[PDB]
Each structure stands twice: as structure tokens, then as C-alpha cells.
Amino acid sequence: ELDEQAEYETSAVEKRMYIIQQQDVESIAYNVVYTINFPLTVDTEQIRVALEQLVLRHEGLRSTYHMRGDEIVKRIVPRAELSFVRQTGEEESVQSLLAEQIKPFDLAKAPLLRAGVIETADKKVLWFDSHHILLDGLSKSILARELQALLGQQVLSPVEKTYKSFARWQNEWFASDEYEQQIAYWKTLLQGELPAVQLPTKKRPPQLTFDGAIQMYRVNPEITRKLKATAAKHDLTLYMLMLTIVSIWLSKMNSDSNQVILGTVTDGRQHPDTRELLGMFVNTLPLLLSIDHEESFLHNLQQVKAKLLPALQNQYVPFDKILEAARVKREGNRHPLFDVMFMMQGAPETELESNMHHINAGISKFDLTLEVLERENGLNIVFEYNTHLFDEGMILRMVAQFEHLLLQAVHGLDQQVKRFELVTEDEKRDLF
Amino acid sequence: LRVNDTAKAYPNKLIMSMLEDWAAATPDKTALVFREQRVTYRELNERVNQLAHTLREKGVQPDDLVMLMAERSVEMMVAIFAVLKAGGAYLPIDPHSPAERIAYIFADSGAKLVLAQSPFVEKASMAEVVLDLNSASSYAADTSNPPLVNQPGDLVYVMYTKPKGVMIEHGALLNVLHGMQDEYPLLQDDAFLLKTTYIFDISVAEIFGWVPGRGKLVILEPEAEKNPKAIWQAVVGAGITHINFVPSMLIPFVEYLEGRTEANRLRYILACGEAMPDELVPKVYEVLPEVKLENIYGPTEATIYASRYSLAKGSQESPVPIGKPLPNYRMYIINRHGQLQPIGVPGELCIAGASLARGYLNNPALTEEKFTPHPLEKGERIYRTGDLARYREDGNIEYLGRMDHQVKIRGYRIELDEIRSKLIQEETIQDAVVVARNDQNGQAYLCAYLLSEQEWTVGQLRELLRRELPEYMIPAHFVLLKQFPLTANGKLDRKALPEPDG
């Protein structure tokens, strides 16, 4: 634990978030929006009071980022005033009321969080808006968990560690032999020529756009259990299975390319003493997967496993460092190493977390993001796609193709991947 | 040689003397057209002579400031020409203006008497000598043309812009009426339409531009002021040949496209008052071929108009220039130190010549501030407009806007016209408004006001601007509108610029 300094160093990933936001101060691209449907019996002031305790409880909600010369620096404010607006409306105007709430953040101003309650005839909808530099995936689970405890009239043990302590530990760890060995793996892996994933898009904008939309494909609970049973039968996780299906899908849409590249997200909780801290820990990893179309689906699952484990073992090299080691920089109309993001988060830890609906405000951080979410014993396969690159009809087709391919893989484990069709029968009929 | 070689000798015979000859040579020729009224030259001239004597009977010497507040009607023409024949200057007032300003204008003007249409005598509160314009009492039976003691140096009208009154001499006006008539001859066959309110210098062109060629004047009704289809009827109905317009009013007028036709007689469209958009030039010609469109520029202190640019049908201008000056006009673009600017360099636009206004009425500290004896006019004074402009290679002047508007934010003083050109490229966006706003000191956030009935969220709007230009000129705020708000002047002003939302 660090001593009470006036100012602290920021982590490499905190530096990246700050740099990205300061390069487009008007961008709401990294706003993390969630909703929770509460019944009318809940007292809204209790929610307001509970959130104010979490503000006082977590330094992340009182953290302010500043630029001291060329060093991105963090200041800890002792007390911050939380904006809490109250509005009454109707279900027909919820989205309109929410759009007015989505405002840019001043990273130099605390708290980096706004909230409010939209009361309707049926529900009292709690809404809160945070920035990703503070609220990553696990942090939200920690927030939902502790808000439920407080609303349930329980007490919380004091937070043992602070984010700034992890920031210093990781900064000093960057100078160790272990880091030099991890970045050496990335140097040898990413030195040669890297594969490019070309998607059937419209003409690309000269510069990167972030307008997007979401389509949700629901894998019913029955199929989901068979997938889990298959993965467990052959010593595999559901993540490895879905990753291999996405890799094959991208491969087939890329003229059956032998190599595919796609990004993923690791929890980034390197030190075990950070599982309870609010903060942005998740690290982005590039996955160089090889799809042998002549081999069976199982053989590709083993190859993906063989390629994945080295990546997960060297997962704690910051993405910006991986860019440095690869002699690659952010240029042009493509994203640096990958254009497809594959995110995956397990089932909600609590009932409150289950009723949290991730609101996409028309944003796509990449060309396409596949976020498989275990929800209600099924799989919510969210297709986050760039609206300038795909029409609504184009994604509904790609989604239908992915569904058709997923159904062939579960029913054809021992079949060669080359035998799985991507084009649907309805597309053949209309072509004729 | 290329810009100010405008010396063209013109007859110094006064405007009413020209009116008199036309009534004496061709009495029965149709002179005015107000709905069913088709007054002839002999009918008009005599009614004018009636009102002239009662003004002379009430001590109207030259430079006498006669006030007027008669809305568009045949009585307006009778009032104007008679006040001109009497010898005094006619001072228009808007009947719909607050009483605090009419009392201010009258007090500051020191006018001797007021002629007002019958309803507007009570609105002219505490006016010393009020001869009701409509009542027959104010007209003397004598119809003999009064003697013209008015010289070219005496005031003809006083146009008010705490407002200020622009004192203008007679000969200054004659130079433009003969100037416009040379370029845009309004002959017997041809007619003019009265669309602009007569509290603005533009109207004086319509009011008098029909006498040099023995044309007719169609007194468009106040009911059809802002109504383009009603205006459009007057074009085909009376065969209007000259129309004065403003960049704002003509776009609705343009929106009635080529599908409508039968306007054979129309010759010229003279736009003035604002910088003309670029898209408006080719859009007009498809809607109305065989017609000459002209861009006009003229401050009130420069005798109605000052500059004109003839727009060829086969040419498209990237900036629409305000053009070259009129006959006997000389325009100068000087920097803040009072020396002439070269081609392309912005500077304060200044007009000089015989057509400069006498100055501001009983505001000498301001008159000498704005009408400064400049050495570039051989000691004669120039009117400092406060407008930024520049010359083209061929010499046509380009209007750039008011001073202290362009800000070197992030190190660029480039105009905002290129920004307005990319918004309208999308069919969902109708027009363009780019105005900077300073809500607080040190916090300046520019705002954009467009017209798109289709919904555009906050996130999508910033990315639409990315497909046009990089991220360094994007407006800090965006505003959704259903119709552009304008002022009562029929113009776009930054005063009617509200706060951003959505």
C-alpha cells in the first residue's frame, strides 16, 4: 500500500484510456451504460444514498486524472459530489430521457459517474453511467454485489487495498525479467507477416468511424447445455469452443484463410489482491489462430487451445506495449492488429447483475464485436457491428450464417470443418 | 482601371422633374399597379402636386425632415414624391415598431412634421404637426407642378439603421437610379415589384427605379410580403421584370421549381443584404432560364446600392462575390491602419464618391467616426462599413462578414463557408448555419443549426462531421430545428441564435 502522496503514477492501461479520451474529448465511445429495472416498492432515495456510500467507499469514484508535464498523473479527492437527477416519464420516452443523460466526461473532474431514476407507471428504472477507465466487467459485478448488500441492509468489510497500490506494483513490475520474457514471446510471435481479415463491407470511410448497432442471437438453454456437455466431454471450456467457432466463421468468410487474427479480453487481475477493487484491469490480447480446414472440428479445438495458453500466460503485457514490440502503430482506416473483438463474460454472480441490461448507445469500438454472454442458461451472442460497414440486412445475414454454422458444428464434432456450409439454403434459392 | 473606372456622366435633373416630364409627354401611360388600381402618370403626378403644396404651406424648406409611417399602399408613393417635391426629406417609420423607438427617433431627428396613414396617427404620439396621409384635408386642390427649389445637395430621405439616421443627399440617389438603369434598363414594357419593407434602403430602388425608362411600379400588398407563391403571382400577373430580393427570401421562392412556368417577361433578379450562397446560383437557372441573376451589395450610408456582380448562366462561383462598383462609385478595402489592401488580403470595406450619404443625423461624433476624410479619395471622406472583404483576381470584391467574427482557434482563420458546403451535400440536410457562441468568458463553444426532420442522435452527428474533415473543426455543440428562426427584417442574424439542445 502506498503512502498518502499528493499525486500518484497511473498504470499503462490508465494512460491509454486517458490518451484516447483526450484525443477526442467529445467522444462518448467509452461510456459504460447499464440499466436496472426495480419495482415501485423501492425507495429511490435509498438507492441515491447507497450510491453515495459507494462513492465515499471506492477511491476510483474519487480519482481525478491530470497532465503534469509529460506524465499522466492521478489525484485522489477526499470527497466528491454525485450528480443525481430524478425524472418521471413513460416507457415510450425512456430512450429519449436516457440520451439526454449520456454526456461527455471530464477526466479531470470527479466523480466519473452519473446516475438517475426514471419512474414510470410500472417500474422505477435505476440508471447509472460510468467510464470504462473505472468500470470494467468485474468492477460492475463488484458494484452490483455491494449495492445489493447495502439495499439488503447488510454491512461491508472495509476495502483492504487501493487501486493506486496496484498501479505502482505493475509499474515496477514492468522492469522485471518476467516482463522482458513475456514481451520477448510477443516479439518472436509478431515479427513476421500478420494475416489480414477482410470482411464483405461497404467502402471503408477514410478514417475510423465508431457508429454501430447491436443484433442479439439467442442460443436457447437446450443447445447451450449440449455445447457445455461437449466442451466438458473433451476437456474444453465454453470460451475455447465459442472462440474456435468464431475463428472458423471468420476463416470461411475470408476465403477459407489458413490464419485468422482477432482480439480478446482477459480479466487482467494479475495480483490476487485486486479481485475486489473497482478499476479498469482488463487487458486486450491479439489471438493468432490457425484453422486447418482439412482437419476435424476437435483437432482445431486442440490447436486453438495450444495457441491460446501461451497468450493467456503472457496476457499481462499492456496492449500499447504489444503495439511497440510489433513495430505497428495506429494508422489508416483499420484498427491496429485486429478488426474483430471477441468478448466473453460468465453468468451473473447475482440476481441483480442478471437484470442489468447493457445499453449500447450506437457505438462500435471496432468493425465487429462478438460478445457471448451466458444469460438465463442460454447464450446472448451480441453482434456489435459498425453501421457504416454493414446494413441491418447484411448483419442479419451474417448472424443467420453464424447460427447455421454453429448448428453444424455442434452436430458435427468429428466432421471435417471443410464440410460445413456457410451459405444458407434460402440464400441459394433467392440466388437462383 | 479594373474596379473603379466607373466615371459616367449622368443628367443632374432631379427625380421628380423626370416624373413631371413623363406625365407631360405621356400622361395616360400606366404608372402604378396596386391590385385593381392602375394609376397613370397624369393621375399620379397631380395627386403628388396636391400633397406638395400643403407641405410648402407648413414651412417645408430643403433639408426639412418629414416623417412617414405609411405601410405599402398608393398613399406611400403619393407621400414620398410629394415630400420630395416639397423639398424636405422623407423619413420612413415602421407602424409595427414599439412606441419608445418612434419617440426616440422623432426626438433625435427633430423632424418638423409627420404624414401618416389614417390608422397610424394615434401611433404617432405627440407629433407636432400631423397631416393625416389618407384624409383629403392634407391635399390642396392645386395640381400645378410646384417649383423645384431642391438642389442635388439637399437631403432626399433619412433612413434609420439606439438607432441612427442616415442623412443622404439628392444627387447621391440620382447617380444610382441612372446607374441601375444603364445596367438593368427598366423600360416602358418592363415593371418593378415592391417586396422589401420601406424601412430598408433596398425599397428605394424599387420606389424610383421605374421612372428613368417610363416603366410601371407594381405596389405589392403587405399581405403578400413573406408569401412567395403570392409574390410569384405578381411576376406572371403583371409581367414583372425587376425584382429585388435577399438571400433568405429567395430560397423559398426557389423551392417552387421548374414545374411552375409562364414567366416570360422576367429579366433580372437583384439579391442584396446578405452574402449569397453558392448553391443558389445554379439552382435558380434550372428553375428560371433566360433570366439574368445579379448579386448586389450596398450599405444604407452608400445610397442604397454600391456593388453588383453579373452571374453568367454557365459559370459557378466558389465564393459568390459582391462584384464591382456601380457608375461613379469607388470602393476601397483598407486595413486597421488606413492603407489600401492588395488582392485577397481581408480588410475593412469602404465606399467613396459623389454617392456617399451626408452622414448620421445629429450624431456628429459618430458621423466623423465613420465618414473620415481619407487621403485615397483626394481628401474626400469614405464610409467605413465595418465589413471585412477582399478583391478577386479580376477585381470583384468578396464579402467576408462582420469584423471580430473570425477567431484563430487552434491556429486557423479560414472561413466557415467550406463547412456549410459539406452539410448540404447530404439530402437529409436542407440548409446550413455555422455560428460561434461564447456562453462564458474563456469558454467559447460554437454551435451548428441545421434542418433535418430525420432524427440524428448525438453520437452519430459527430461522426457525420468526421466523414467530411478531420477532428479539429467539429462544432462543439449541435442543435435540432424544425424551421430556421429569423428576425422581422427577413434576414438571418446572430441575435436570433438560441442555445444548443440534443
Swiss-Prot record, chain A:
Query: Coiled-coil stretches, from where to where?
Result: none
Miscellaneous comment:
Linear gramicidin is a pentadecapeptide antibiotic produced during sporulation.
Instruction: Print the domain comment field.
Output: Two module-bearing peptide synthase with a C-terminal epimerization domain, which is probably inactive. Each module incorporates one amino acid into the peptide product and can be further subdivided into domains responsible for substrate adenylation, thiolation, condensation (not for the initiation module), and epimerization (optional). At the N-terminus, contains a N-formyltransferase domain that is probably responsible for the formylation of the first incorporated amino acid.
Its assembly, as annotated, is: Large multienzyme complex composed of 4 subunits; LgrA, LgrB, LgrC and LgrD.
Q: Of which family is this protein a member?
A: Belongs to the ATP-dependent AMP-binding enzyme family.
Biological role stated in the UniProt entry: Activates valine (or leucine, but much less frequently), and then glycine and catalyzes the formation of the peptide bond in the first step of peptide synthesis. This enzyme may also play a role in N-formylation of the first amino acid residue in the synthesized dipeptide.
**What is the name listed in the Swiss-Prot or TrEMBL entry for this protein?**
Linear gramicidin synthase subunit A
* Organism for this UniProt entry: Brevibacillus parabrevis
Specify first residue, last residue and whole-protein length for the fragment: 776 to 1207 of 2273
